[PDB]
Amino acid sequence: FGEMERDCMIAHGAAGFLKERLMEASDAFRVHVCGICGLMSVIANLKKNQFECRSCKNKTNIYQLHIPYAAKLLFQELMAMNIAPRLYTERSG
Amino acid sequence: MFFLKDLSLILTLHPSYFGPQMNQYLREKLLTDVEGTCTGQFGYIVTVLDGMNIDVGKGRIIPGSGSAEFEVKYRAVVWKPFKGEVVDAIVSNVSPIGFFADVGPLNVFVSTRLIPDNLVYNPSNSPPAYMSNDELITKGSKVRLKVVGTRTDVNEIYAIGSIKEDFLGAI
Amino acid sequence: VSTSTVGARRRRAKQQVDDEENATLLRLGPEFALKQYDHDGNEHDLIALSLSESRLLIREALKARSRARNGGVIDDDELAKVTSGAVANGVVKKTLDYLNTFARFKDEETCTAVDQLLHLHPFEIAQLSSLGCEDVDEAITLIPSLAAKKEVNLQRILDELNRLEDPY
Amino acid sequence: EETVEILFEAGAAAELDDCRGVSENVMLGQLAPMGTGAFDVMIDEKLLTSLPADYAPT
Amino acid sequence: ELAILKEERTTTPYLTKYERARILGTRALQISMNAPVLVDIEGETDPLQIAMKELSQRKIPLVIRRYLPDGSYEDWGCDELIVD
Amino acid sequence: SQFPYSSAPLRSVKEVQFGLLSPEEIRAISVVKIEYPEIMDESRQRPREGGLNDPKLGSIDRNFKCQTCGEGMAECPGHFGHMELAKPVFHIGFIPKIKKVCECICMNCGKLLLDETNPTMAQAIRIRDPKKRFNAVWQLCKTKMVCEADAPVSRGGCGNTQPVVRKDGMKLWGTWKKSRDAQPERKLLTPGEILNVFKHISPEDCFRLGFNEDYARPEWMIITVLPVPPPQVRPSIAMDETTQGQDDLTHKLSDILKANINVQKLEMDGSPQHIINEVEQLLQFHVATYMDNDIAGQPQALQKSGRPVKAIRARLKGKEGRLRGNLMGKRVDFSARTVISGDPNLELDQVGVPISIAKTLSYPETVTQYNIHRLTEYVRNGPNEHPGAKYVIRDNGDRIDLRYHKRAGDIVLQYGWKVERHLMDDDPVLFNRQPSLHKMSMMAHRVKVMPYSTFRLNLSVTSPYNADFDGDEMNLHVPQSEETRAELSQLCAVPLQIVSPQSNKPVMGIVQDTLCGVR
Amino acid sequence: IWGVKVRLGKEKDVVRQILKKKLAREGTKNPLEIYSAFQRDSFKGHVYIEARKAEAINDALKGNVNVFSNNSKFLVGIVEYKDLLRPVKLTRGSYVRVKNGKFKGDLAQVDEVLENGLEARLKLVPRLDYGKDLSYTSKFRPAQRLFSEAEARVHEIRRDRDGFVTYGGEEYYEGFLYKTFRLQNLIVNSINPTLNELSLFDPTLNKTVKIRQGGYKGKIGIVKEANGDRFRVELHNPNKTIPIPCSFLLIESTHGWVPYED
Amino acid sequence: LKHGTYEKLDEDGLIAPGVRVSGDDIIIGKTTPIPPYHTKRDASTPLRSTENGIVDQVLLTTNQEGLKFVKVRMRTTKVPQIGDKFAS
Amino acid sequence: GVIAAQSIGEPATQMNVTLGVPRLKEILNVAKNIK
RNA sequence: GCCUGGUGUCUUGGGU
DNA sequence: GGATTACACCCAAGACACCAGGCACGAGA
DNA sequence: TCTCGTGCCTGGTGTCTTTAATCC
Ligand SMILES: [Mg+2]
Ligand SMILES: [Zn+2]
Ligand SMILES: [Zn+2]
Ligand SMILES: [Zn+2]
Structure with missing residues (x-):
């Protein structure tokens, strides 16, 4: 599903279809982020049901995201080059 | 220490619950999930005010899943204790390492190195008590302590007291 | 899980140690700031409640809801059975019984008298009502923030509290 | 174009991306603000109350 | 605050092709998860067909929240928007 | 739904804040310190703790659970380490900006050479865009060739004349004009020297330089501790089953780690100074080509095979990199492709689909009261008889594979389950021929299942696809949910596309035989 | 200079x-x-x-x-x-790491050094097989385990003293190998003990079939899948695998094609 | 082990000419030992998933290094059908 | 936006002053010195 | 008695 | 006087570190 | 039986000199 097929679905205005193709029908992945620092630094043990971002000492303000695996990969490659991509779930202006 | 707090809860509703009494179901659902629970951020949520009249707003439909998301804004009575706050209590247990005191929902532990020397644990007395001459600490005895430290388990919070100061003790 | 009106709390360059809850230093944390906002954005003073106010509201809310559960049809042990679940049964019963053995003004007649008497930071005004005191000497020791305010009436506060106070 | 250079420069000047573009949301796999995604759908609680009572949530 | 009062709504009173497609799909989806259906179902039992039948009788219980560029919005019920 | 339940609230991303990772933060998120370049314990199985495959960094193996999160390899994201550098080195990406900062500040105390007293300069601080403001400031201060101790009243200056800093590969040279003409002595401006100068820049001057006190603090452009990516970023591959080679990054991190130990091996004994400069420059080299191996003006780092090392920068750029090759477009499930043939006895909006393709593709139809009897019939027929079905999916997510279920007759379907049934008549599918030059390269057709292995098109749609039947192939995509079926039929369907907005006229007509014959 | x-x-x-x-x-x-x-x-x-x-x-x-x-x-x-x-260690009783041979990487105690001063006698946990497959390398060696003289007695040995045996021309005393190594073959500096060192110191599938009823009567095939009642025969004659009921098959056995009495 | 059938191999590890094969069937069985019973790993070659036909001839010999070396030629017949390409 | 992009580009893919693709290129590239 | 992994990087020749 | 730009998708066949030093085994004296 | 030579395996580490147009 190349770049030119992406554009055709935009022209049709079929935004819902395009989202599903590139996620549920491919490499959908769940990540956890810290609500304070916005990094994917959460250590999540799901059977023990305990979460902690050690940097913020935060066990309560934590969100889960659905993003492409290849996007998760991209952010870890950016972190490895000292670039911080902080994902926040709310605006502020 | 009691407060009134305006809180809110994100509720996800399965589409099979989309009937004419939807709001009434949500009102019952909010109360079952929130009343009696504790968080380190606010404390114990004791009772919610005006439960049968809460305005739930409109539900956002989640794209791709069909379920509906309500933000139920509400107002509750909350109870959180604080470090530095002097409070009264009712003793629940007495042991060689101190005593345990029920202050409403939770229990506070006061250790032995923060208890004055003249209060001596007397097991032979019937009933057992911390005793003096004009002082009497049996179960249900008004005692005055000061909260010197709050620890958070995010499920139940734990506070440690002290009677190693002026005017604190039995009255 | 459950959240409030207060949001974001994004990172700032200078840290802060005016956050640690200390009732002596009037540090109530970020959730219990002096000026709060309700669910419409309107400004509002922090609502701290004495033992006497709290006993009336909680008991009223439970019996009005209990009446509502009965389609519109006193004792603390009866009022706590309105809750759902043994976990809920526990916390509510223990809170009423605790208040049952430490609330001086156990009726609305005396309580409204105390309400009008007390109604200047809002937290201190609520502290004075919760902690019974005899004299001015006893109030500024256990609550050392009342020291440098230079506005007593304290004695007439304690006299009215103790006079309204029924025998036991 | 200039893919890596943009991102290095974006880091050094702490750029904020407000996620309003189509391309931003597509690569993060979120419903883009276009066409069928240009609005939200809410549940009409008022219109549900005209249904009979035996359809009610318990 | 952001919400625009009913008397002052300015956006178009016709259902757009994009709003129509989203309404039909969302309502179809809810029916396949066993939401209560508001019309009589005769012979046509496909999820999409039932949703299209409800649309034609103005009986879909949903509200469109149309966002305007500044972030404000007008809520329009699908019961009141005119469908061609 | 394929994700196990988690109590954390689900939200979407509204903002991406870029910035730099401070040295302190890198240690705060790290789960292990990395010191030894020997990957294996002693080639006797189980990899060495503190080594580059320390199991705390994560699992890429189906049988070892992560010792940090307890999750299987599928869910486990991987956790970063950190590698302490004996000496701070430059980040190769930020050198030209570092160079720009030197001409702006005092090379002793670090203060901005101009004040609001200068009228043109007071106009330049008003510029709202940080990048343009920084450039406007530097455009003024560039000609200011001495840091004044005194206002043009002390400004905090040290009085020193400032050097003209020049870049020479990975090294920066500064030429100071000692006080007509005399002799100037240009000494090397090491990273460590510049590092200390940057920490003394005030918060007020940090803002005026377009940097940001919380997110992009200027001393963080110098690297002191390197984040060690988890094995998911650099997986091992097995060339011929029992022989595995390592990723280019794994070999390159070994080289940085070896080179790091030798800097520790110098400062405690035999250092003939001229040797310290050869070993420190080599650490700078390896850290540079680890991030960017296309540095202009110097030879590329090479693998022993002779071909250049695949640096991180090269991973992201170009047609096959992460952005253009995996994010703006990617390979997808539920697709099919074959040679096309025409059929005049199909409706305009139909597509003839070979039986074999129709048994491989599937649609997950939710079980309801109105179709439960119908769907049970499909389950008994199984995966090999059409019309049939391949899986039954419970609300928990466990799939029952109907190829291997010998007690298929004992399944009773519950409402809310899903049955992945075969593709069947009148299902909408998206049909597509490359190159997709305009929007009618992708239209929704109704399936008609047919024998033989070509896709069938009614002849009047050949024109918008610019298709013919001389060997062309076309692609078919199957929507996977109730919402997208409706989007296809109500927006993308063939009859809606008869008139195109390109030239307010039709793009399909009667063609070839039928047009010749109708005359 | x-x-x-x-x-x-x-x-x-x-x-x-x-x-x-x-x-x-x-x-x-x-x-x-x-x-x-x-x-x-x-x-x-x-x-x-x-x-x-x-x-x-x-x-x-x-x-x-x-x-x-x-x-x-x-x-x-x-x-x-x-x-x-x-221009610029090793003491008896100290630990070193071996740099060569099957014991490469192993921790060893220095027992003694040669008079001349070149090779050192090392005390080592052995890596032996007791001659199990006789008629060694560091990549195809054995796990480490103390020498067991009764195991050697049972399976494959010369007693030399109390607790001292020569087994396959190597000396083992109280379970440890004592073997001489060149000093240049051991590492004496910056040794890091490891974790481990701290601890120590259906019956018709795939059978050929003939079909006796139906349109494919008389054709050879192989049972590809036999889930239940409906078989999958990979026919030989056209490149197709068919679904077929069990009443229709003859199976080959010792004597001819046999009906469902096999 | 691979998911396909191994039942067409003879005892020498090689399939014999004349046997029809379908996709994913193993036609050459080979193992590799696992370094440090139950010591080997499969390294066998399956027929390409999209193909079928008859094994025609099997060459067995040794290579320049002296180890064993096999080639298996498979033949099938392709019959023109809808979709096949032709040209004058 | 996208509709505009495709509507202009598609005719170009099938097509003494400069005309056709070289002239089109000068416009989008807003060259200072046209041919 | 459920789960079930087979490579990569290039180069060259082709199809529309 | 420097890089960056240079259609899209797809198929298939055809390939893979070097040198030096040390240790062990075998053969010859 | 001892010594020397050759071969194989494992570990560590590079270098004789020898396609064209655009803008910024
Ligand atoms: Mg063609
Ligand atoms: Zn954090
Ligand atoms: Zn993990
Ligand atoms: Zn200075």
Whole structure:
């Protein structure tokens, strides 16, 4: 599903279809982020049901995201080059 | 220490619950999930005010899943204790390492190195008590302590007291 | 899980140690700031409640809801059975019984008298009502923030509290 | 174009991306603000109350 | 605050092709998860067909929240928007 | 739904804040310190703790659970380490900006050479865009060739004349004009020297330089501790089953780690100074080509095979990199492709689909009261008889594979389950021929299942696809949910596309035989 | 003293070549005016040359194929000279790590050293097989385990003393191998004990079938899948695998094609 | 082990000419030992998933290094059908 | 936006002053010195 | 008695 | 006087570190 | 039986000199 097929679905205005193709029908992945620092630094043990971002000492303000695996990969490659991509779930202006 | 707090809860509703009494179901659902629970951020949520009249707003439909998301804004009575706050209590247990005191929902532990020397644990007395001459600490005895430290388990919070100061003790 | 009106709390360059809850230093944390906002954005003073106010509201809310559960049809042990679940049964019963053995003004007649008497930071005004005191000497020791305010009436506060106070 | 250079420069000047573009949301796999995604759908609680009572949530 | 009062709504009173497609799909989806259906179902039992039948009788219980560029919005019920 | 339940609230991303990772933060998120370049314990199985495959960094193996999160390899994201550098080195990406900062500040105390007293300069601080403001400031201060101790009243200056800093590969040279003409002595401006100068820049001057006190603090452009990516970023591959080679990054991190130990091996004994400069420059080299191996003006780092090392920068750029090759477009499930043939006895909006393709593709139809009897019939027929079905999916997510279920007759379907049934008549599918030059390269057709292995098109749609039947192939995509079926039929369907907005006229007509014959 | 960059691994060769040139030109009208040259192992890729004039350095290296042609020589400070010539453990009872053989990487105790001073006797946890597959390398060795003399007695041995056995010409005392290694074959410095060291110290599938009823009657096939009642026969004759009911098949056995009595 | 059938191999590890094969069937069985019973790993070659036909001829020999070396030629017949390409 | 992009580009893919693709290129590239 | 992994990087020749 | 730009998708066949040093085994004296 | 030579395996580490147009 190349770049030119992406554009055709935009022209049709079929935004819902395009989202599903590139996620549920491919490499959908769940990540956890810290609500304070916005990094994917959460250590999540799901059977023990305990979460902690050690940097913020935060066990309560934590969100889960659905993003492409290849996007998760991209952010870890950016972190490895000292670039911080902080994902926040709310605006502020 | 009691407060009134305006809180809110994100509720996800399965589409099979989309009937004419939807709001009434949500009102019952909010109360079952929130009343009696504790968080380190606010404390114990004791009772919610005006439960049968809460305005739930409109539900956002989640794209791709069909379920509906309500933000139920509400107002509750909350109870959180604080470090530095002097409070009264009712003793629940007495042991060689101190005593345990029920202050409403939770229990506070006061250790032995923060208890004055003249209060001596007397097991032979019937009933057992911390005793003096004009002082009497049996179960249900008004005692005055000061909260010197709050620890958070995010499920139940734990506070440690002290009677190693002026005017604190039995009255 | 459950959240409030207060949001974001994004990172700032200078840290802060005016956050640690200390009732002596009037540090109530970020959730219990002096000026709060309700669910419409309107400004509002922090609502701290004495033992006497709290006993009336909680008991009223439970019996009005209990009446509502009965389609519109006193004792603390009866009022706590309105809750759902043994976990809920526990916390509510223990809170009423605790208040049952430490609330001086156990009726609305005396309580409204105390309400009008007390109604200047809002937290201190609520502290004075919760902690019974005899004299001015006893109030500024256990609550050392009342020291440098230079506005007593304290004695007439304690006299009215103790006079309204029924025998036991 | 200039893919890596943009991102290095974006880091050094702490750029904020407000996620309003189509391309931003597509690569993060979120419903883009276009066409069928240009609005939200809410549940009409008022219109549900005209249904009979035996359809009610318990 | 952001919400625009009913008397002052300015956006178009016709259902757009994009709003129509989203309404039909969302309502179809809810029916396949066993939401209560508001019309009589005769012979046509496909999820999409039932949703299209409800649309034609103005009986879909949903509200469109149309966002305007500044972030404000007008809520329009699908019961009141005119469908061609 | 394929994700196990988690109590954390689900939200979407509204903002991406870029910035730099401070040295302190890198240690705060790290789960292990990395010191030894020997990957294996002693080639006797189980990899060495503190080594580059320390199991705390994560699992890429189906049988070892992560010792940090307890999750299987599928869910486990991987956790970063950190590698302490004996000496701070430059980040190769930020050198030209570092160079720009030197001409702006005092090379002793670090203060901005101009004040609001200068009228043109007071106009330049008003510029709202940080990048343009920084450039406007530097455009003024560039000609200011001495840091004044005194206002043009002390400004905090040290009085020193400032050097003209020049870049020479990975090294920066500064030429100071000692006080007509005399002799100037240009000494090397090491990273460590510049590092200390940057920490003394005030918060007020940090803002005026377009940097940001919380997110992009200027001393963080110098690297002191390197984040060690988890094995998911650099997986091992097995060339011929029992022989595995390592990723280019794994070999390159070994080289940085070896080179790091030798800097520790110098400062405690035999250092003939001229040797310290050869070993420190080599650490700078390896850290540079680890991030960017296309540095202009110097030879590329090479693998022993002779071909250049695949640096991180090269991973992201170009047609096959992460952005253009995996994010703006990617390979997808539920697709099919074959040679096309025409059929005049199909409706305009139909597509003839070979039986074999129709048994491989599937649609997950939710079980309801109105179709439960119908769907049970499909389950008994199984995966090999059409019309049939391949899986039954419970609300928990466990799939029952109907190829291997010998007690298929004992399944009773519950409402809310899903049955992945075969593709069947009148299902909408998206049909597509490359190159997709305009929007009618992708239209929704109704399936008609047919024998033989070509896709069938009614002849009047050949024109918008610019298709013919001389060997062309076309692609078919199957929507996977109730919402997208409706989007296809109500927006993308063939009859809606008869008139195109390109030239307010039709793009399909009667063609070839039928047009010749109708005359 | 000048330093000069040379091809890695060729430092000793360059020092040699300089000596030959010096000695060959002694007493001639054009002597090589260097005094000495040397190369330190710790300083890879460098040779140091002692002289009075820089021109002599160029003279010493002229035509040397191991020297980089770039005019890269550098001057050493007098205060740096002696450090260039700095020449620089092992005690009985201490631990070392073995550098060669099947015991490569293993921790060992130093038991004793040879009189001459070259090889050291090491106490080692053995890696033995008790001759199990006889009629070794470090990649195909055995796990470590103390020598068990009763296991050797049972399976495959000379008693030499209390707790001392010679087994396959190696000595084991109280379960440990005692074996001599060159001192150059052990590591004595910066040893890091490991975690482990701290702990220690249906019956018709795939059978050929003939079909006896239906349109495919008389054709050979193989049972590809036999889930229940409906079989999957991979027919031989056209490249197709069919679904077929069990009443329709004959199976091959010892004597001919047999109906469902097999 | 691979998911396909191993029942067409003879005892020498090689399939014999004349046997029809379908996709994913193993036609050459080979193992590799696992370094440090139950010591080997499969390294066998399956027929390409999209193909079928008859094994025609099997060459067995040794290579320049002296180890065993096999080639298996498979033949099938392709019959023109809808979709096949032709040209004058 | 996208509709505009495709509507202009598609005719170009099948097509003494400069005309056709070289002239089109000068416009988008807003060259300072046209041919 | 459920789960079930087979490579990569290039180069060259082709199809529309 | 420097890089960056240079259609899209797809198929298939055809390939893979070097040198030096040390240790062990075998053969010859 | 001892010594020397050759071969194989494992570990560590590079270098004789020898396609064209655009803008910024
Ligand atoms: Mg063609
Ligand atoms: Zn955090
Ligand atoms: Zn993990
Ligand atoms: Zn200065």
